[PDB]
């Protein structure tokens, strides 16, 4: 269950999805945001992630649990200009710079994201019969 | 002209963000309750540490994000956060709720001050 959430909150139609990967054969960590046209990412490097785990609480030894938190808790603000993402679930507030992922990389990610979500919905409702 | 802005960005305004002055704080209010950074010299220095170049102003960068409609805000539970999305990196500020007795004179002064500023601005725009 990789965490995610949509925006805006509540009734209205969803305009953005925020999600992340991956801490686990483990990948480095990133947040993603898409309007299902374009895709923005933290595009972290080891140093830049470390320097953000600097500016706030954590040791370099996961952020997933805290993003999972703000998702579960609908606690995510977002702002784009020619982007930034804020997690307000937890004790301190975290701010993330996000930049555009180039098309050739973004397209396959979006495609895979769509198919994956479809599989997850099927599987979730099967596990709702329980 | 101490910078400020209101959100949400033509719908009716529901919050005002502002700051003073340079000890420095950011403030946010719905004109009923008031949230603040509640800085001390050390805590502000330490935030100008955690990011931010030299500990030697933030006003210009808050002024920036105001002018540029670039301010996100989240409230809950006598806790809030304010995010400036102007510059090299996005800045986040934890704000806590100011108790009523401490907030009232600040809200009172804010209101009167804004009134005086509107009068004197239109005087200086009656110019052109």
Numbering used by the authors:
A (entry chain B): 5 to 28, 33 to 69, 71 to 91, 94 to 141
B (entry chain A): 5 to 13, 15 to 27, 36 to 69, 71 to 142
Paper text:
Non-homologous end joining (NHEJ) is a major pathway for detection and repair of DSBs in mammalian cells. Here we perform systematic interactome analyses of human NHEJ factors and identify a novel XRCC4-like protein named paralogue of XRCC4 and XLF (PAXX). The crystal structure study reveals that PAXX forms a homodimer through its N-terminal domain that is structurally similar to XRCC4 and XLF. Thus, our data reveal that PAXX is a new core NHEJ factor that plays a key role in the organization of NHEJ complexes for the repair of diverse types of DSB ends.
Immunoblotting of the Ku80-associated complex further validated this finding. Based on the sequence and structural similarity to XRCC4 and XLF (see below), we renamed C9orf142 as PAXX. The space groups for both data sets were P6522, with two molecules in each asymmetric unit. Seven β-strands (S1–S7) and three helixes (H1–H3) were observed in the PAXX 1–145 structure, in which a globular head domain and a coiled-coil stalk formed a dimer, consistent with the observation that PAXX 1–145 exists primarily as a dimer in solution. As predicted, the N-terminal domain of PAXX was highly similar to those of XLF and XRCC4. Compared with XLF, PAXX showed more structural similarities to XRCC4. In XRCC4 and PAXX, the angle between the head domain and H3 is only ~45° due to a lack of tension. Structurally, the N-terminal domain of PAXX is more similar to that of XRCC4, as both exhibit a 45° angle between the head domain and the helix stalk. In addition, compared with XRCC4 and XLF, PAXX has a much shorter coiled-coil stalk. The extended stalk of XRCC4 is required for Lig4 binding, implicating that the N-terminal domain of PAXX may lack the ability to bind Lig4. We generated a combined mutation (Nmut: L96D, L98D, L105D and L109D) in this region of PAXX, which is expected to disrupt the hydrophobic interface.
